[PDB]
Design a protein around this ligand. Structure first.
Ligand SMILES: C=C(C)[C@]12C[C@@H](C)[C@@]34O[C@](Cc5ccccc5)(O[C@@H]1[C@@H]3C=C(COC(=O)Cc1ccc(O)c(OC)c1)C[C@]1(O)C(=O)C(C)=C[C@@H]41)O2
Lengths: 551, 104, 131, 71
């Protein structure tokens, strides 16, 4: 009750700065305001009263409690309308849009650049009720923006990084709303907001369209490059198997198998010529100098190419695991031939190591076939899980027992690694010549050998049960999604082209006239087709088609 | 039936990858051998004896180097251990998601 | 369910009869307040009930769980540490770690007032462990 | 859970001190007046904060707080 007489005392005093438009001053709640409290206390009536007294509907709460990454902080953007949107109060939003005094504008941005839709994406994490609330609020706010302002398209407004809510929705790993945005159909009063159509439905077969305005890699900074080279969430492999992405990636992958096979064959020819040069190292000097020039140009080519890749798209281990090996291998080969032309007498182990590393690095191209593609993904999952920590523990055991045997040995067991070789050759079954007889006690070394054997058996058995534990409690529909993601990475890399050859890449999808805009000209979009078979079509009514005759 | 299912699922991938490993390491060892490692067949025989446990290893010590040879043999044994573990866990993943009616 | 019902109602009746007595503070012959006995014997659900217990307005002081402030979806809850903190000798944590004998000692540590507390102490004393 | 338990035993043993130095420990948590006790004085207790997030708060009800202003 006292508020309107208190505001009346504020008005009748003749204040130059009014009381209701006043900000908190601390660092923690910087720029907080009365209207945010009125909204958060679930009161429609006090919001109405404060709007009648002249409250600022653009009070930017830019404080330290309103940042994303501080502990126990609530991010909603800074706008009051954003707060009423996030807190699921519909009529408050409707009053803030349709009040007669100081109307709200959806095009307004926070100090961080986010509008109401961006922050509404930011607050959705995971549930049934959270995702249903977020999707319903999103669609209702789009319809209200459509009836409020026909001027601008609201989803076109970018962030400070340059993101529309689709792109940022994929970047932050929000999946359910992202699925909802990629397949979204509205009704007849405003159908021009939708993205999905039906071209024709001839009984149980139907052809759906999808718009690709920011999904195709022809446009700069697409959702594809954001999923591949910018998304850090561990749920990216669920974000690839969606409906209008799968048809596009299948079409592009079957469109550009032959460049993949061609580059694979050229790399095989490279390694065969390198094999001949490494075997006939030892007239024939013409072929040897041709081998010098050929391996030099190939190593220069691949070293510069992977250096250019490492410079282009990097901003962290297993995803980028493949390219690092080729970069190191090409550096090793070019350094080996550089020291060889320098004649530095170090070039033979570098040459043999480069040959080994190059033939081991051929398993990059096992991703074309699924039967070895799943196998290579399992190799990477072995490489991430147990190998590093297990090798560290094994080095602890090895170094301890080797120094023990060295200090026990007073002409076998001469040095540290010269006995560490005996200790490792003992684990596979080539250990020999016990009872060294240079000291009285050899049962010491007997018990050391028993201890080392039993503990290494324990460690291998622990690595086995760790691999079984990590592999059994994971869905079978995971490695296939990882394979589809890795194919997506590779096909976008090949669509980028060569580094010495900038390709004139092409648009995908058919351009057609999807409908009419509410302002004049007909809406024409680029679209991707997808067929579908549904035997439950006779329960529901038939949807609105574009062309009746199936083309 | 499980013999046929295992040979059908493992051979045409695993022996191919393992063959790439053996051939690369054998050509590397013959190259790094400047009477041990006499021919390519004997070198592949030695490198498979290390998979049986009969390979006789020593320092080269008047050659290119010795520890390079040693570290390459280390890498061979550890990577084949990796691949055998991979074949095991793939067969266990195929065994885990199965039904008791199917083999019958 | 019957135990938490009888326990809360019996504490309310003890509040209504004699206010000067503090009933959850009386030790046994082993020297144990009943929360500590519930921790030592390895009884789970009643212990979880006692650690987070809230009551209505006529008896506020019996309750242990307090809300500092609630602002929309985020909330700040206060827990009491009258017998939980290891500052005093013979705390509940000291009973769990050392003096107990139950086979479910790992199950009781993931509870609400212990989890963030051990989180805070461990992150406060990482560097001397590394030292 | 077993990892949490072993970490708990370790952090308690390191909090106790080593053998040649028994150290006066530190209390943890915030001390404040929570409410009023029915016998005279207000309730004065030590507290620990936990900040938690939940989305069913609208259809459910809000309870009474200790401080109206968040701080
Ligand atoms: C980056 C890692 C993880 C790595 C880099 C080098 C040092 C490597 O040693 C390791 C550690 C190691 C050593 C010995 C046995 C197992 C693991 O394994 C690979 C790495 C282990 C081998 C085999 O590589 C693989 O794991 C398979 C593989 C290669 C390339 C791929 O794109 C790939 O994905 C499909 C899989 C290649 C080496 O370069 C090789 O043959 C020599 C000379 C050293 C090997 O480190």
């Amino acid at each position: 009750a006292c508020i309107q007489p208190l505001l009346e005392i504020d008005r009748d005093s003749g204040n130059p700065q009014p009381l209701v438009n006043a900000q908190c001053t601390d660092e923690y709640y910087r720029g907080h305001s009365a209207l945010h409290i009125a909204i958060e206390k679930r009161s429609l009536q006090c919001v109405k009263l404060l709007v009648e007294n002249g409250a600022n509907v653009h009070a930017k709460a830019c404080g330290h409690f309103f940042q994303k990454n501080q502990d126990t902080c609530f991010y909603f953007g800074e706008l009051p309308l954003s707060l009423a949107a996030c807190t699921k109060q519909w009529d408050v939003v409707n009053y803030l849009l349709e009040n007669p005094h100081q109307p709200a504008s959806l095009q307004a941005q926070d100090s961080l650049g986010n509008t109401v839709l961006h922050a509404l994406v930011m607050i959705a994490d995971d549930s049934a009720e959270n995702s249903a609330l977020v999707v319903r609020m999103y669609d209702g706010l789009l319809q209200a923006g459509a009836r409020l302002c026909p001027n601008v398209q609201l989803e076109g407004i970018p962030n400070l990084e340059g993101l529309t809510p689709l792109k940022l929705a994929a970047k932050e790993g929000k999946i359910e709303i992202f699925k909802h945005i990629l397949q979204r159909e509205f009704s007849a009063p405003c159908q021009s907001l939708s993205r999905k159509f039906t071209e024709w439905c001839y009984g149980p077969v139907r052809v759906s369209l999808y718009d690709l305005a920011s999904v195709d890699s022809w446009e700069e900074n697409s959702v594809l490059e954001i999923i591949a080279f910018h998304s850090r969430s561990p749920h990216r492999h669920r974000m690839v198997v969606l409906e209008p992405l799968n048809k596009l990636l299948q079409a592009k992958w079957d469109r550009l198998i032959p460049r993949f096979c061609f580059n694979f064959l050229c790399y095989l020819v490279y390694m065969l010529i390198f094999t001949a040069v490494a075997y006939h190292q030892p007239a024939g000097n013409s072929m040897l100098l041709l081998g010098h020039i050929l391996i030099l140009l190939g190593g220069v080519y691949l070293l510069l190419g992977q250096l250019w890749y490492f410079w282009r798209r990097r901003l962290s281990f297993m995803d980028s695991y493949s390219e690092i090996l080729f970069l190191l291998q090409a550096l090793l080969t070019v350094l080996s031939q550089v020291l060889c032309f320098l004649a530095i007498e170090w070039y033979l182990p570098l040459l043999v190591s480069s040959l080994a590393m190059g033939w081991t690095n051929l398993l990059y191209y096992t991703r074309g076939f699924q039967h070895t593609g799943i196998y290579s993904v399992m190799i990477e999952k072995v490489i991430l899980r147990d190998l590093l920590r297990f090798l560290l523990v094994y080095l602890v055991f090895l170094f301890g027992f080797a120094v023990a045997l060295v200090s026990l040995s007073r002409p076998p067991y001469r040095s540290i690694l010269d006995a560490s070789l005996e200790l490792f050759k003992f684990t596979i079954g080539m250990g020999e010549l016990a009872f060294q007889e240079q000291l009285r006690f050899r049962g010491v070394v007997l018990l050391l050998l028993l201890a080392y054997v039993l503990l290494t058996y324990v460690l291998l058995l622990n690595m086995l049960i760790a691999l079984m534990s990590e592999t059994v409690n994971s869905v079978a529909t995971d490695s296939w999604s990882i394979w589809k993601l890795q194919k997506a990475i590779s096909v976008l890399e090949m669509e980028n082209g060569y580094w010495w050859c900038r390709r004139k890449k092409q648009r995908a999808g058919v351009m057609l006239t999807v409908g009419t805009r509410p302002d004049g000209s007909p809406d024409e979009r680029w679209c991707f087709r997808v067929g579908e078979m549904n035997w439950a079509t006779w329960e529901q009514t038939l949807p609105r088609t574009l062309c009746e005759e199936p083309s």
